[PDB]
């Protein structure tokens, strides 16, 4: 089995940038490495073949090279249609194989998020158990630490998160936290808060409120 | 012109079976080599079976030896994939995919030329329930102020997937819906926000309409300040 290493996991870049992927092979595949790009919802879409042989219809600022093991994607000049993932794909021998995909972002300045936290609805409190909600909204880069923290406990294995693709307008990333708690747990407590560390932030931002009405 | 048409995707428990169909159209089925590639929410590419132009040779990632079997009918010009021994681990959307010729020379081992549109498989002991609804309201440290955020929680569905819009569509400026995540219970759980000016409040109402087919679930939770 013939694995793909891609490098990198994903580059931020504008439009009219030079980008550059390579895909690395454990063995050698003489020339039977092709390039797709994928968009989210759609199928993959075939780029080049043969390492360097365009596919028909291709715009030509997508240019493959390489031979053996080291192989290497080019787009000489980003265009807003190119953000999208892109995998390369070993043909030489059986089963089949991928590399892990590389993500072309869009390339923004810096935003600290806002920061906001929503304690459970008397509602769902009636069922048994309560969901704490913290929203970091409109962020960029994607990297972010959500801590969640009762009674100055700091939690683990209680929480998920969610993130959204970059925004159509803003290029920013919202992202959601969801603790979980059982409701006899949730009144047994007060305070409960949101530490959100970004590279924005000069300090971490904490939100919180304390359960009763306050 | 050229497509690949698939179907037979669905939900099944752990343990069953399923058939996966793709059929084909605008060019020589019999003379192509085929293949069948899968990719899990979130996660890449992974190619599962392949098989012949005459269907004489048939090869099978090591994940699903002994569990999956590829075939082709020629009149049919139909790709099938039998998936028996089905496990939460093979839930992804499944594509068929044709190899591409160089030249005319027909090579099974190629770049994939054309792909179906994908058919979803969900291995879960999971049963169909509608979502319980849930207000993510406004809040405050002062009376007044600039930008609020206010949303809604939608917890405890299955399956995929649920639609959520903000007053009948009226609403669309500063709404994310998040990706749903899949909780230890085997239910889904997502939510929706929307960041609204702080004078809105008490005078906008704001409702999350909330709709989940698979369940014929519809929802509206109209969301205030407490």
């Known amino acids: 089995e013939i694995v793909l290493t891609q490098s990198p996991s994903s580059v931020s870049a504008s439009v009219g940038d030079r980008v550059t992927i390579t895909c690395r092979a454990t063995?050698?595949?003489?020339?039977?490495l092709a390039w797709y790009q994928q968009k989210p919802g759609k199928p993959p879409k075939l780029l080049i073949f043969?390492?360097?042989s365009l596919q028909s219809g291709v715009p030509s600022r997508f240019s493959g090279s390489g031979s053996g093991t080291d192989f290497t994607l080019t787009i000489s000049s980003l265009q807003p249609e190119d953000f999208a993932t892109y995998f390369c794909?070993?043909?030489?021998?059986?089963?089949?194989?991928f590399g892990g995909g590389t993500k072309v972002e869009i390339k923004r300045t810096v935003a600290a998020p806002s920061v906001f936290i929503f304690p459970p609805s008397d509602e769902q409190l009636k069922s048994g158990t309560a969901s704490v909600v913290c929203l970091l909204n409109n962020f960029y880069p994607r990297e972010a630490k959500v801590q969640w923290k009762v009674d100055n406990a700091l939690q683990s294995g209680n929480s998920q998160e969610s993130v959204t693709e970059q925004d159509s307008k803003d290029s920013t990333y919202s992202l959601s936290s969801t603790l979980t708690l059982s409701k006899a747990d949730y009144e047994k407590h007060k305070v409960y808060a949101c530490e959100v560390t970004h590279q924005g932030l000069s300090s971490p931002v904490t939100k919180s409120f304390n359960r009763g009405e306050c | 012109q050229v497509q690949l048409v698939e179907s037979g995707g669905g939900v099944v428990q752990p343990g069953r079976s399923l058939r996966l169909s793709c059929a084909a159209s605008?060019?020589?089925?019999?003379?192509?080599?085929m293949h069948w590639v899968r990719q899990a929410p979130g996660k890449g590419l992974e190619w599962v079976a392949g098989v012949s132009y005459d269907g004489s040779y048939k090869y099978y990632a090591d994940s699903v030896k002994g569990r999956f079997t590829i075939s082709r009918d020629s009149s049919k010009s139909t790709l099938y994939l039998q998936m028996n021994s089905l496990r939460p681990e093979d839930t992804a959307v499944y594509y068929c995919?044709?190899?591409?010729?160089?030249?005319?020379?027909?090579?099974?081992?190629?770049?994939?030329?054309?792909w179906g549109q994908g058919t979803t498989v969900t291995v879960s002991s999971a049963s169909t329930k509608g979502p319980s609804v849930f207000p993510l309201a406004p809040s405050s440290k002062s009376t007044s102020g600039g930008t609020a955020a206010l949303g809604c929680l939608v917890k405890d569905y299955f399956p995929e997937p649920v639609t959520v819009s903000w007053n009948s569509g009226a609403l669309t400026s500063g709404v994310h819906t998040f990706p749903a995540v899949l909780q230890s219970s085997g239910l889904y759980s997502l939510s929706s926000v929307v960041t609204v000016p702080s004078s809105s409040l008490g005078t906008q109402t704001y409702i999350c309409n909330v709709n989940h087919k698979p369940s014929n679930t519809k929802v509206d939770k109209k969301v205030e300040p407490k």
């Open positions: 995919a044709r190899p591409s010729a160089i030249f005319g020379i027909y090579i099974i081992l190629n770049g994939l030329d054309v």
């Open positions: 794909q070993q043909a030489h021998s059986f089963p089949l194989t």
């Open positions: 043969g390492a360097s």
């Open positions: 063995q050698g595949i003489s020339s039977w």
């Open positions: 605008g060019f020589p089925f019999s003379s192509y080599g």
